[PDB]
Design a protein around this ligand. Structure first.
Ligand SMILES: Cc1ccc2c(c1)sc1nncn12
Lengths: 198, 197
């Protein structure tokens, strides 16, 4: 079941679809971005239609919904990256083995921001040769989360006496989360690519 | 959920001890004894992990479509320490969990063609009581190439398309003895053999 609102991809498995401003789908992403990035301007927003990534992500979403007690397991988050990474993320998603060490490390995993502003820093969304910055808008299975720790390679157990019964993700602060870290493949779907400039 | 699994009372995870001398136990024992006939089998357990199985079959179906054929699966061995057994049973193989074992063909999970390679103490580390642990694993080796140190994913098939990757890497493409996979849910742990020297 690929979402019915996607463009027909004609038996092909990947497509980047450029959105039209004035449509709700474009305007809602612009507003979530501009709420903390008013100093920047969007060149374009592309919807990522990746059938394999969607299938694997929605399988993990279904399992986390079954495992957790009627939780909102999914957040819409931002990820700034450099241009060299964009073809790889587009095709293969977020690979923790490729992840930057974050300035404040709450674990060795893939980082995702509540605020576009955080992802808009040049450290993440490194401007390319043409001054273009790249930011993903990402469905993330944050699930049940705890404050992380720089040493984590997996999320911590909820209970030290049950080592395999893990939290889903970790955050910088559980009362005001600004960051989430995930430690497993297909726990994040890159849904949109915002291309933007100063 | 495979026919040869036994009922789980609507539960998602069960380890099920095989009966000695029945067909399923005999098949798995023979794979091990081919190179480990000098070892002693305490027991074999079928890992029934619905979640792991479902993500693996999804990845299998994707690879069968992409490779345009259905010879992507191999049966391989993985030795591990007793303290890693609960994690593998519940969450499968994880490339970020890898201490002072060699990663000379890349930073992925290592699987052996021969049980005797997994039977080494450096991999199947004997516990206090001399008990060693080896998994029989369904691995999506798909299309493979020679590996090398420092790989985080397998190499591209053609560098004119950097994103079309090989499925796995090996030590030797003519006569492979190990495979490394770089993604979660490319490996399903199907049996656990508890044994001693
Ligand atoms: C280089 C290397 C590293 C780990 C490893 C092998 C070979 S064969 C095997 N069976 N379980 C673990 N491993």
């Amino acid at each position: 079941n690929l979402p019915e609102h996607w463009t027909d991809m004609n038996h092909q498995l990947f497509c980047m679809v450029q959105l039209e401003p004035g449509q709700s789908e474009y305007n809602t992403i612009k507003d979530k971005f501009t709420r903390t990035c008013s100093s920047y301007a969007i060149e374009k927003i592309e919807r990522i239609q990746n059938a394999f990534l969607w299938q694997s992500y929605q399988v993990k979403k279904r399992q986390m919904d079954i495992k957790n007690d009627h939780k909102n397991n999914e957040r819409l988050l931002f990820h700034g990256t450099d241009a060299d990474s964009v073809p790889y993320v587009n095709q293969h998603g977020f690979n923790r083995s490729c992840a930057g060490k974050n300035a404040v490390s709450y674990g060795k995993g893939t980082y995702f921001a509540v605020d576009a502003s955080y992802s808009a820093k040049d450290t993440y969304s490194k401007p390319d040769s043409n001054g273009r910055k790249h930011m993903y808008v990402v469905r993330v299975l944050t699930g049940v989360f705890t404050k992380g720790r720089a040493g984590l390679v997996t999320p911590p157990p909820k209970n030290p006496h049950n080592p395999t019964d893990l939290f889903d993700s970790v955050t910088n602060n559980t009362r005001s989360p600004k960051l989430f870290v995930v430690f497993f493949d297909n726990q994040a779907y890159p849904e949109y690519l915002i291309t933007f400039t100063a």
